[PDB]
Design a protein around this ligand. Structure first.
Ligand SMILES: CC(=O)N[C@H]1[C@H]([C@H](O)[C@H](O)CO)O[C@@](O[C@H]2[C@@H](O)[C@@H](CO)O[C@@H](O[C@H]3[C@H](O)[C@@H](O)[C@@H](O)O[C@@H]3CO)[C@@H]2O)(C(=O)O)C[C@@H]1O
Ligand SMILES: CC(=O)N[C@H]1[C@H]([C@H](O)[C@H](O)CO)O[C@@](O[C@H]2[C@@H](O)[C@@H](CO)O[C@@H](O[C@H]3[C@H](O)[C@@H](O)[C@@H](O)O[C@@H]3CO)[C@@H]2O)(C(=O)O)C[C@@H]1O
Ligand SMILES: CC(=O)N[C@H]1[C@H]([C@H](O)[C@H](O)CO)O[C@@](O[C@H]2[C@@H](O)[C@@H](CO)O[C@@H](O[C@H]3[C@H](O)[C@@H](O)[C@@H](O)O[C@@H]3CO)[C@@H]2O)(C(=O)O)C[C@@H]1O
Ligand SMILES: CC(=O)N[C@H]1[C@H]([C@H](O)[C@H](O)CO)O[C@@](O[C@H]2[C@@H](O)[C@@H](CO)O[C@@H](O[C@H]3[C@H](O)[C@@H](O)[C@@H](O)O[C@@H]3CO)[C@@H]2O)(C(=O)O)C[C@@H]1O
Ligand code: NAG
Ligand code: NAG
Ligand code: NAG
Ligand code: NAG
Ligand code: CA
Ligand code: CA
Ligand code: CA
Ligand code: CA
Lengths: 448, 448, 448, 448
């Protein structure tokens, strides 16, 4: 279990609104990396997922032997452990168990979550290029693997209701899932088939971030028209790209008990990868900006239970215009107008302040993470701290031109020294070993 | 415990003399690295030690937060696990436990060894520059830490007899130790004080490798004179630089039961770092070439027991003129004449063939490892396979100029597929994260 | 069920057009044969049928106690199991159930197919020499046996419509059938009676392979005339030798629900033995060359359903001039001109590349299998890989003169190691035990 | 379970003394072989073990990929099933489960035995040439694997008392073991160390078959002297070559509960491979003639229990001078005089008549099996029926010169047709597939 210094400083809003204004990033600290490196120049390690809870943490990433493209073979590395203080005062992520799922099943886009006594991981089995998944009416095989600290492993092929003949494809968001009221929730996304109930119930719905008006040159009527069209992709089999949550009861004999809960397209942007968080008793969702709006998307999620089962989810966006992501064409970091984009990168963010602490939800919110500081290239990885409109602290890593990709950020507090540490898991392009080197950067978020 | 595919292919001579002539190195294979990376540009990870036995493996290395120099603080990372096959057929070193000794004790030059149920590590506590250790008549504190797989940890300060007032300094060789007949043996080296019994019993002794004559331009009398002087260092407090073995009985209450067994200087070169191996029931020793002879030094060690206690060791050298190491001045890779050098690098080698299988010990021996292919710079890391006089297979890693340091090589056979794999743990200079990135390269040694 | 290493590498085109050009056959690998041997010098085991699907495989062959000729007694051996990896990396066909249909019913020319939970086998009951079957206006009794993995066995005598008074004889093609959209499809062939609707609707129809013109010395008008006559056999009761497909709904009370679907003689050659395959969602058919064209015949089959029932089939030939088969007289492997032949051997082929991946269907197709390399004798069994015009890789088995007969080839990929294996089931003439020894040769199809 | 036609005709003496005089071998019958064949010319399948009991049968053999020599890798094929009648009246060994132990553990000289609900197999792990096993004072690892029909598999490393420091080596006899009064008994053999209690208690003991006197030209005193020396092998590490029985209680957590019971050297010849049988409630033992006496050795074994545990075994030889085996030098099939031989072949025999039915034990005994009819070569496999002094029925298989090796014979009666069938499992040298083809020949033993 995690050291006494951290058990009470996990999954919480660490600073008050007033303190958020005076936060800065401290130097990067050196700790032994718990994320394994490739041992060949061409080896590819990508798509990390990290879950940290009161008792322990779970980590995983995909491994492809040659290059970063394969719709046939790949392995998935899983790791779990605890956090303990070093003589210098900062954290050391102590790995207590390692697993390497290597058996011919092409498990991809995996999301992992901490569960009592272990980790629960959700993946889909890839057997063809992603685009092909959207055209085929049949969805890929879905799997949830439970790995207990006592080395017992139980993998199940799941068939949640409302998936077959509704979703042409379904993928975990790769971002961490969360254990909530006895259920494990994972972010999901995919393409819905035209004519289905879901498609019809979503017809004419759209979402436009609160701060777009002041930045978009198009009029309200034009924005609305373009936003509605941003949820449909002709390139991806003419499917409605949908975001949602997969709720699975913690059982070892899962079959069709997991529930697919899609977000209303009136509250969320075009479906994309994502991540779920827990701040106190509140669930939050991060949605990758793979559509027209290039800014960080965070939402407070309200989950409704009907007869002990999740029945519906509602999302309230934290309005911001900060931390853009690189995109292609008319969907770069400089875009502000609705339309149809299918480009971007995964770059989640951690809320250091409570959005509900202000009279108007999210009026003054502070968050931290990493982002690729450029308009269209996946370059210049930069760790930051920002509020709704400005970056109040940042530090680029490496020299300009340094390639990078996804960035998963997680923060926790040392209740002993009373300092907050954040880990920024970034996929860095390396010139020595492997295509990428996933690095768990760690530093303090200083108040002052 | 290790998979059934490896339990019977560990610590053995894998090939016959005839087969050794047709061995070649296969491509590097990609597996998840079990050696942790630094998370800052200046973080320093160095001095690895690796022990692999029938049941499991032990790994460790030193971590310094800023740069690679400190005689005050540093931490020591320890790891242990097993080997299991991947769907591609090659090994995956599965970490089952991690430890980070971080408490203010500056444990350095640590050597680790597998023991039933865990790992035994031997370190010395550094409190001043190395050179200062040789001048002070008092030796550094010595410690042996036993770490059981059941998480029990027992550290002891040891005071073996014949150390105080004999050795001005004493260090573990950093190379792996071995569990032999109930005792854990570790390679050691240091400086002996003038006038001591050890010094006197070693007076006028010297060792000259069998293949030096044909390569040295000096006459026999001159070589003998210079060789005798190569065991004394005026730069290192005028001490006799000695190599040896530390034998510790496997106990949890060690105090003065470990025994310091020095090698006769008539059979070994000037003391240096080293490593111990087990090939069947035979113990072997690798001695870093930190003196005048720049070639790989391997010896078969014969241990004598008197009343259940190791009482003396004898070493028989495997005569070679292959695989040189970079050195400074008149002690570079091109040197062949006796004299006093105090320069070189650690680069052990694994014997793929049995030296005793030939009528004349070591007449035709084959070994593998890595070496820095250059005369004086620690550059061009190159993995190879060689016999007594030639390199019969090699492959440089990275582009010329690539900096590197130590190299620990270990081989084992998959008794299922019947192929031999070797792991080459090399300290590589990295430009992205940390001063060095210790990489566990792995590839096959192909027969044909 | 099959190991995770194979469940996703079955019934697919494994290579791209570009990769097909660089394919070669690896050494034969040794695995325990799952095909039973005879225990007497005269015992005869022949006519194998093999079906491999995602979950498991089904195998069967005919057993005659004395010699290879009997129109009265014979037994049929059935076997089923899964595929799992060996420590050497290659497959082991693990038999999980064996059955020996020995009860006096002379079941012949059986074709077998995998079905959910078991195997479905289709045979006809022989009671007289084959030639006699064509002269008698009454067709032989037809039977389909379902054998579930739970040991339940259900055999039914079927009477599909349009058989009585239309087909003088009807036989399964012996090649595997396939489970498609809830129906089990089997290849069939036989002789149709003059004056029947089928006969009339087939009148004046003929098929000439695309690559015959350039190789045949006869003019177009003469070729057309001879091709039309190749579908009628005076030796076989003056019947129209027809090829087709038998579609049976997966039920345990089959009576007259199976449907006989003949191929149009404008798209297929004279009826003969055959086999059905599944490549993704596409059905393919292999037609033994028992007529004038001695080259491998493969067709993509398009099945039309009318009210949930197969109503018609269409075949598109993959144009080739490669891999001939031994024949008698003016119908040997060297023949190229239309006429009436009734000679040849069964030698199916597996498509390693997708014929539809080229702008012009089958313009560049690659396939593998075995063939008897000789003009008129059933001799020199040779495994190969070939494209439309040339054999790009081959290896004869045994010494010249080695007798053999049928060859059933099936390939699948290990999604773990990412290699393709093909099994070549060949009837080999043996000098020790039995007339023939049906051997499941297995080797890899290497890319490079 | 076995068909009703065989459940009551297993493990019994089938004929009376009077009927034994009129027994003859019927033609070989053709049934589908349940023993798997190799699929490469060099593949090697050898060392079969077969156990047949009231409910079912167990079968196993060793598989080496290249040639028949390896002290590192090999796999072990296991099979189990039942017996059922065919329409022709004779047996069909129906395989209901197959297993292929392929994981890097070099399991050799395995003996298998039927147990309620499955099979228990006993093997030793080879890691060096056989001769080396006798010189090393440490015995090879011993393992017993239980394989239940419900697919549960439990393998255990056993350490029976009195093995370490007593037996330099220990091997299962490869012949079948038997389930007796809740214990599984396996034949064993190996080399005992000089000076051990076993060695001392065996000192000066020897056994000379009752019918040697009349055939040996040496006098009684000389025979006795030479016989005593035949139990010690200087070629095999100067060990006393011992035969015995390993008794294991049927448990799934075996550790040190199995008991090593050596035969008194006053009742048995030099240790060798062997087999255990059950005839009614009596245990019998077959001992390979690897010493000076080249004739078939069968003994009735009396087992003594002390506190529910086997405590001692006694053997009574069935005196014969029939069915010799090929041997080397002065130990060929023509030898009759005591001395030290270490040559021969495994060729067990089944007793068709009860040796205890005669006033003088074994005065008139009849048995059947196969033997290599030649003086020194492993050639001319011949199935027979013989009494103490003559072969009363025989039939060679193949043409003279045909190579073969071991032969395991098992007989049982069809209580329906009232006929006895015997299966002769013979390792035949094949020219087509594999080094050997282990064939389960089957025929009737006719009374008349
Ligand atoms: C299931 C899957 O493939 N997931 C990948 C995701 C998804 O593509 C994303 O969530 C949208 O569905 O994203 C990642 O893959 C992208 C990456 O390989 C980049 C590299 O340039 O290319 C993207 O594809 C572009 C393509 O390059 C364009 O030419 C055009 O075809 O549009 C596509 C849009 O997808 C990949 O999607 C990612 O790195 O962000 C990784 C996940 O494996
Ligand atoms: C206890 C200890 O310091 N161990 C280090 C060893 C020992 O120095 C070696 O076994 C000989 O006693 O070696 C390592 O350290 C050397 C490394 O830092 C190099 C880098 O250039 O410098 C060596 O020192 C040189 C120095 O650079 C010269 O100017 C001159 O003073 O000679 C000294 C000789 O020691 C370090 O010894 C090593 O990397 O090989 C690392 C161990 O920590
Ligand atoms: C139902 C049946 O008999 N099937 C057999 C098939 C069919 O004959 C084939 O699909 C054409 O209808 O083919 C196999 O049998 C042939 C084989 O026994 C060879 C051996 O030489 O002889 C063929 O018959 C020849 C005969 O030898 C000629 O003299 C002349 O009469 O023509 C006939 C043509 O049939 C057998 O057909 C086969 O091995 O290919 C086996 C099937 O059992
Ligand atoms: C554990 C083991 O090796 N078992 C093998 C047994 C034993 O050798 C036998 O029980 C005596 O200990 O026997 C088998 O192996 C023999 C076979 O390979 C023959 C082939 O010629 O050679 C025998 O070795 C001879 C050798 O050829 C001679 O030159 C001289 O060295 O004597 C040895 C005597 O052992 C093998 O033992 C067998 O086939 O009978 C097979 C078992 O694997
Ligand atoms: C943060 O710093 C500002 C600037 O000096 C100070 O005025 C403010 O009180 C601090 N914020 C709080 C309340 O911690
Ligand atoms: C290795 O290769 C050589 C060169 O062809 C060959 O002659 C030799 O027999 C091989 N070595 C052995 C004995 O494995
Ligand atoms: C196959 O080999 C050829 C010959 O070197 C090479 O040029 C080609 O690129 C390879 N085919 C592919 C694309 O895999
Ligand atoms: C066996 O055959 C002999 C020879 O005819 C006959 O005399 C004898 O009675 C038979 N044996 C018995 C008793 O079955
Ligand atoms: Ca789909
Ligand atoms: Ca000192
Ligand atoms: Ca008919
Ligand atoms: Ca031994």
């Amino acid at each position: 279990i995690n050291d006494n210094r951290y058990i009470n400083g996990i999954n919480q809003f660490y600073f008050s609104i007033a303190e958020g204004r005076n936060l800065t990033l401290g130097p990067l600290l050196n700790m032994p990396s718990f994320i394994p490196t490739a041992t060949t120049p061409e080896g590819c390690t990508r798509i990390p997922s990290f879950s940290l809870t009161k008792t322990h943490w779970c980590y995983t990433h995909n491994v492809i032997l040659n290059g970063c493209q394969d719709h046939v073979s790949s392995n998935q590395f899983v790791s779990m452990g605890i956090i303990e203080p070093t003589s210098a005062g900062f954290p050391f992520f102590r790995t207590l168990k390692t697993l390497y799922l290597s058996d011919g099943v092409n498990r991809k886009s995996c999301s992992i979550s901490t569960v009592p006594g272990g980790c629960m991981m959700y993946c889909f089995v890839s057997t063809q290029p992603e685009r092909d998944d959207y055209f085929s009416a049949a969805p890929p095989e879905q799997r949830i693997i439970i790995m207990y600290y006592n080395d017992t492993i139980v993998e199940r092929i799941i068939n949640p209701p409302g998936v077959l003949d509704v979703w042409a494809t379904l993928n975990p968001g790769t971002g961490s899932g969360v254990y909530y009221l006895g259920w494990v929730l994972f972010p999901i996304y995919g393409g819905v088939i035209k004519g289905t109930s879901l498609w019809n119930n979503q017809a004419n719905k759209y979402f436009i971030p609160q701060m777009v008006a002041a930045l978009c040159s198009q009029n309200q009527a034009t924005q609305v028209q373009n936003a509605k069209s941003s949820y449909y992709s002709s390139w991806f089999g003419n499917r409605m790209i949908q975001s949602g949550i997969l709720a699975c009861p913690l059982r070892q004999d899962l079959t069709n008990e997991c529930l697919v809960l899609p977000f209303s397209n009136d509250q969320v942007l075009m479906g994309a990868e994502g991540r779920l968080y827990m701040y106190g008793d509140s669930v939050y969702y991060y949605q990758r900006s793979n559509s027209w709006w290039p800014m960080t998307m965070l939402y407070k999620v309200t989950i409704t239970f009907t007869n002990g089962q999740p029945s519906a989810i509602s999302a309230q966006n934290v309005p911001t215009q900060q931390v853009p992501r690189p995109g292609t064409g008319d969907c770069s970091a400089t875009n502000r107008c609705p339309g149809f984009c299918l480009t971007g990168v995964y770059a989640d963010a951690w809320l250091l302040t409570n959005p509900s602490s202000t009279s108007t939800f999210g009026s003054e919110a502070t968050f931290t993470g990493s982002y690729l500081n450029t308009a269209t290239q996946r370059i210049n990885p930069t760790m930051y701290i920002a509020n709704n409109t400005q970056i109040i602290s940042s530090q680029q890593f490496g020299s300009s031109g340094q390639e990078a990709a996804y960035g998963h950020t997680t923060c926790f507090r040392d209740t002993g020294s009373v300092m907050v540490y954040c880990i920024y898991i970034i996929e860095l392009s390396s010139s020595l070993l492997g295509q990428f080197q996933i690095v768990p950067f760690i530093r303090q978020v200083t108040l002052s």
